[PDB]
RNA sequence: AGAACGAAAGUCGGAGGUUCGAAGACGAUCAGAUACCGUCGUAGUUCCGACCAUAAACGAUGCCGACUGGCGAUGCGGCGGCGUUAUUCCCAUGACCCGCCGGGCAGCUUCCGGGAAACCAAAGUCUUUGGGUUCCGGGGGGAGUAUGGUUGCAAAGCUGAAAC
RNA sequence: UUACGGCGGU
């Protein structure tokens, strides 16, 4: 009984970094989450991962290095609109210069600030710092 | 005075208020 | 270690093998199965050597990085490694804390006995936790020639050799001494230290007056 | 700290471990640094140079100083590499 | 007129390690209180925030004991929080402070965006909990001030620290512990990762082996 | 635990209007029962005769008479 | 507070157990609460043995046991002595307690 | 109702151990050196100083109490630094290993360079303990 | 919403009646004993059937799912094995011995971490706050009572206020 | 074996 995939994989990281492992295995993948780690990758908390590709859901294999603090998530994921970015850039996020918001929009996979940057808004996803 | 000894002297109670409901209909 | 001066030298090899030091207890912790080579029929898990020699040699890397020669606080509270712990720093020139250890003494500076080193190494960690969890305070990396029996707490160079029988301490101690002079100038890597492992073994009750003076009928009497 | 000017308008720069990678705090009373001591490659004798670790408090505690030290050093030029 | 015992102490009587700022990062037990007092002498101001009378119950009569709670500080961040108990007050008052100089910490002053001078706020939204009392310090905006309780808004004007909001949880008039909390957040601006201090820490010599001249040069 | 989901808020508005009851103050103000209670019924001031000077002794660390009227 | 990890009595995964009853004060207990005590005591009291084994119509006889299985309620074994008042950080022992058989 | 106080077990300690070779196993000796030695008040507590030194003059002159005096630590070192035989208990090149240890040093590649006879240790497995009190 | 099962006591009918024993009858001890203790003893403890849904029904811890220390040990399977021991003078399974793997009641340890602390490998992953979903609680008394509903042969249960 | 009580505010 899995009601999310994208809530446990950004909770078993969550769990591995502050015991603090080179490598965690998030064990159900998909295109919703390589698309995910892959803005946590391109902006640079975490390092190469493999995906162990099989012919059911895949496996994913972190490399870790210990600059990520947490990562959780907003399992309802709600829509937000552009003026409503900003009411949650300080409910969730420590302070504006660093962490990610990072939302699917119709453009894409973005964090709040390439949201920001050319005109869309979409479905909150999740959130790191 | 215990809380099980409140009960059934309050159930000793409870029955005899409702028969004097009973009396005057 | 990786040299060919600092090579296994077979020689100590077959002292390795004669003084235990592959002879465990019969229990690994879960941080030192990386240590072993397997088990015995007989429940006793043996040390691959090459395991324990390239910590002893890495050990002594962190010996001679201490600048000062009298401040590596050598300890020990078992009995055996009690006459091993007092000449191994007549032999490097340190400080010997052999015994019962005065809890008190790395952090409560008024009293005379306080002592604030930069190194210390242990015999067991387990059964000498005392200097350990007070070297939780003053921030100083320790050394203990552990066993597959202790647990690996406050240690950060643990040797994995043998720490119970008498003989397996001495060698382990005479191998460090002849090792952290040899890292330095003292002995000069072909001349061999001709210092003999008998001079660090734990001593046997007073049948010794009785002994020594029956192989000397010959020279006094 | 990389002001707006640009200049280091700061404390001091805060350590890092070499195995956990997290800050080591101004007291964080448990945190080594240790010195390992290389030797030339000719006579295994002690040159001048050294190399440094760092191991902190927390992950001291936790049981894996030599576990850390063991690993972090075999991939940097100490002993064995295989 | 004074003499030290032990060796961080023994090496600045001659003035020989400068400006706390390292010893805090290689992270030493400071001992006595004349180090804190060597450096940041003449930059404190030793105000206190409670007096309360704690006792215990004995064969006869009530052991009255007295407590004294104070905040020592610059105006640049180096702040600390002393706890004492003795039987007389005074006595209390004075060797608390000689126990507040003694747990002192520095903190990290940050931006809340737009870097444009010098820094004025927490680096991010920090915790500090002390049994149930939990003080988060949240950044704010340029020319807001420090916005809290009074007892943390005599440290927060004790940090230096110009614009702060603070908010509570708990029961906050358990005096003491609302004044250790706040204290749990303002010791951990260096312990919380801020992701542009991601570089190699260049591992320089320590004081304990390149101070080993003087260590028994004149002294031993 | 709670009930979270992006189409819920029946669920949580229905399970809200009958747990603001069971504090005193949302009770005693929208019930209607407790502005019969009190005998200004929506007021603070309102006039009466006196009828007997009428005294009550005062609780326990005390003991004087406190003097009253019955309006 | 709760005094003890196990609730007192030494069941997990039951609902119900077995009631007896107590030797003395013949009170119901469940079976895993009750302290029992076995015992295996020589039936003659063997300083009597001496003055019957003259009396004895062998030589070499087995002199029997006797096998009574004491198991006591909580209330009547404190009042015995044969458990006692423990303390808080020598509670957590399941050892019995040393023999010296001599 | 004998035993006597700690100021005088601490007085008389730092006597013995400071003036042993002055002293000797009887009592009107040591009556008369701590008369001399040691600033003493009254006679009463003087010789009950005395009585523990020849109780303990008739106990340091057999074993090592805590008696540091140079004497008897100037004689450990025929015993922890002496005894340096003439032949180890390590090096006679006659010992006996195991089947898995000669393994062990074949990785090692000293078996070759080692005469090492092996016995195959006992077999059964009879190790751990039987389990349960009695 | 609604369903099934639900200790003991209770009611009702018929067998049943050994032991124990509400009530009650005495005998004691007591200032006074309608109680602790003793003999007697009804209803009941027993069965078959038809009821009531209440318990400290307690793990005082809702169900499901994942992740995160170890160590010896345990039960039901399965795997691989020195051997011993069983018709067996040989096998195939049995027993003990040494391991590992899955599920399960549990345990000892641990500045993982949490907490008001007792203490929890969950009460951990929670101000660094959102895996789903169900119920329930808002100072204490009044009170799980007054009433209305509905259920039951009855006892009462379910739903359940306010003044003060 | 038996063994009851202790006015109110300080
Ligand atoms: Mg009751
Ligand atoms: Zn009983």
Redesign the pocket.
Known sequence: ????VL??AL??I???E??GKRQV?I?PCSKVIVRFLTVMMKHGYIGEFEIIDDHRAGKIVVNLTGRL??C?????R?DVQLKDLEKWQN??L?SRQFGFIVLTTSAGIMDHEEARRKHTGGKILGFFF | MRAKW??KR???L??K??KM?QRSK | GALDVLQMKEEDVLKFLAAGTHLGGT????QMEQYIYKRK?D?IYIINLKRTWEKLLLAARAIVAIENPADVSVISSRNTGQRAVLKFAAATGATPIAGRFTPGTFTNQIQAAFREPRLLVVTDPRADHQPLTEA?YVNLPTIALCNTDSPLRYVDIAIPCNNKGAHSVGLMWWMLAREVLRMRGTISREHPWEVMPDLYFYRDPEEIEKEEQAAAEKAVT | MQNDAGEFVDLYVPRKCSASNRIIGAKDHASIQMNVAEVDKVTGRFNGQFKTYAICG?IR??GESDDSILRLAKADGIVSKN | EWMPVTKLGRLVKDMKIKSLEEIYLFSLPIKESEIIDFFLGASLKDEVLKIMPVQKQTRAGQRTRFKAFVAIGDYNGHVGLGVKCSKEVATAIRGAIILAKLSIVPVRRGYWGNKIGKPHTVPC???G?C??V?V?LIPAPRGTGIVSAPVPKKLLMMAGIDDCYT?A?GCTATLGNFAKATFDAISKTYS?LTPDLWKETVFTKSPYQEFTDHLVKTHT | ?????LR?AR?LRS?RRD?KW???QY??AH?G??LK??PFGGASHAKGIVLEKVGVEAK??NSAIRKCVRV | ??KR???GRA???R?HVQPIRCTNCARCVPKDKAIKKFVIRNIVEAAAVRDISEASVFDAYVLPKLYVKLHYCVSCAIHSKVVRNRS?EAR?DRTPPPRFRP | GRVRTKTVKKAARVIIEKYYTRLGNDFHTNKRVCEEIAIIPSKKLRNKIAGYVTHLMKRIQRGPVRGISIKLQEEERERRDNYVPEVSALDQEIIEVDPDTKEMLKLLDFGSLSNLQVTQPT??????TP?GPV
């Open positions: 009984v899995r009601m999310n809530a446990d909770k078993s969550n769990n591995a502050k015991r295995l064990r603090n947490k959780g998530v907003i399992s309802p709600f409910n969730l420590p | 409140r009960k309050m159930r000793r409870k029955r208020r409702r409901r | 229990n690994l912790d879960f029929s429940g939780s | 927390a505690r936790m | 939204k920090v915790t909990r049994g149930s939990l988060r908010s949880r919380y | 635990g709670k009930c979270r989901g819920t669920k399970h747990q069971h504090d005193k009770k005693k019930l029962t407790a209670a009190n326990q660390p | 507070t709760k990890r196990n609730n069941k997990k995964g609902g808080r957590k | 077999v059964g497995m009879n190790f751990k389990r």
